[PDB]
């Protein structure tokens, strides 16, 4: 999946 | 044209060889974003997307990398005629930035899943004609570097990316999409979003990258995921080594989220002789306080997550309280849904689970339990206070009755005799900012919490059932 770079968590 | 000095380290045969290439580029006047993104994307493809045939590391031969680089520079130079966009004074025009944005945009596959992993890099752009949201912004900046536009730089909030450019670097332009089913604002400034005090534009306290920070961004953008269960050890190692390289050169100084990422990596696999994760999480918070007016949420979320994973309940509660103390000075706006989801999950899932385990451990005789610590109760109350104050003046509400059952449950995890110790004072001692929590004060020390009254005070609801 995609998360914004260096966003914490999952 | 790659320059002769850029080619001498190839072929890259290992993680360490990639690190040497980054060190060399970061020692140059300007690091070559195109080269470095192509290398990272190549290495990620063969370590995470397709590991067929892998025996150690996917050797990056110069012929291969240079051919990819040439495809990129050819497209951009072919599609963007700089003669049409004269540069007054060493600085770029809004029309030029929009043209580069259009060239990247229009290159992309007509239909693809924008939420896929491994579509962040210029390797993805060239080989798959696919980019994720923020990847489009990075690619615009890489293209502008390739065109010689030294003033165009990446701007980053905690959930979006755009560019700055122009006289004194003071202009902003949207160059990509945000979220799903929002309307495109490409070409426009970010001033409306700053003025409305949304989290998405951080009240103007967003990151303005230099070229070295843009390298840091691409490193944070490495995705070691092979599948839901498995990460690439090789890519984790690479990311970690590159972040330490950047840290040592000073390029993470103004990048809280990168500092938190590095701390998370160090928790996973500590590097001997380096700072502890906690030191790094605190450095991230210090960075946000120093450079960004303490207007960032994620430095505290990173810290809280560490405490939560390590079952430091007190310190987790304190960090989430701190997270709420930042959000309170924002207005909750239409494209802020990601930070709403983060606060909702903390309030309505993470904290309840933590307190449930604490309750079982207290039953089994734990000492120094957060549940018997009134400063822990005060942190829980300050977390809710910040959320309630966030909602004040916002164009869209935050709280609803689906929050209220969790609040009542969490309050009830602390015995009345603990709750009584907190003294709530007006302008352990706590002062509420929000009108909602001020009205709730007297309900907070009864032996059995008045669930119904709590619900009424937390929500817009003002009546009970008729019958």
Author numbering:
A (entry chain B): 6 to 15
B (entry chain A): 2 to 53, 74 to 386, 399 to 460, 549 to 588
What's written in the study?
pmcMenin, a 67 kDa protein encoded by the MEN1 (Multiple Endocrine Neoplasia 1) gene, is a chromatin adaptor protein that interacts with MLL1 (Mixed Lineage Leukemia 1, also known as KMT2A) to regulate the expression of multiple genes, including HOXA cluster genes. Menin has been identified as an essential oncogenic co-factor of MLL1 fusion proteins found in acute leukemia patients. MBM1 binds to the central cavity of menin, utilizing Phe9, Pro10, and Pro13 as energetic hotspots, which occupy well-defined hydrophobic pockets, and positively charged arginine residues (Arg8 and Arg12) that are involved in electrostatic interactions with the negatively charged binding site on menin. Importantly, recent clinical studies found emerging resistance to Revumenib treatment and patient relapse as a result of somatic mutations in MEN1, leading to point mutations of T349M, M327I/V, and G331R/D. Understanding how these mutations affect menin structure as well as the interaction with MLL1 and current menin inhibitors will be crucial in the development of a new generation of inhibitors maintaining their activity against menin mutants.
To understand how these mutations affect the interaction with MLL1, we tested the binding affinity of wild-type menin (meninWT) and four of the most common drug-resistant mutants, M327I (meninM327I), T349M (meninT349M), G331D (meninG331D), and G331R (meninG331R), with different MLL1 fragments. Further structural analysis revealed that point mutations in menin occur in a site that is adjacent to the MLL1 MBM1 binding but has no direct contact or clash with MLL1. Furthermore, T349 is even more distant from Pro13, and the T349M mutation changes the conformation of M327, which adopts multiple conformations and approaches MBM1 as a result of the bulkier side chain of M349. However, similar to the M327I variant, the T349M mutant has no clash with Pro13 in MBM1. Since both M327I and T349M mutations do not change the charge around the MBM1 binding site and do not introduce steric clashes, these mutations have no impact on the affinity of MBM1 to menin. We found that the binding affinity (Kd) of MLL1160 to meninWT and all four menin variants ranges between 0.5 to 2.6 nM, indicating that all these mutants maintain very strong binding to MLL1. Our structural analysis clearly shows that all these point mutations exhibit a steric clash with the menin inhibitor Revumenib, overlapping with inhibitor fragments that extend beyond the Pro13 binding pocket on menin.
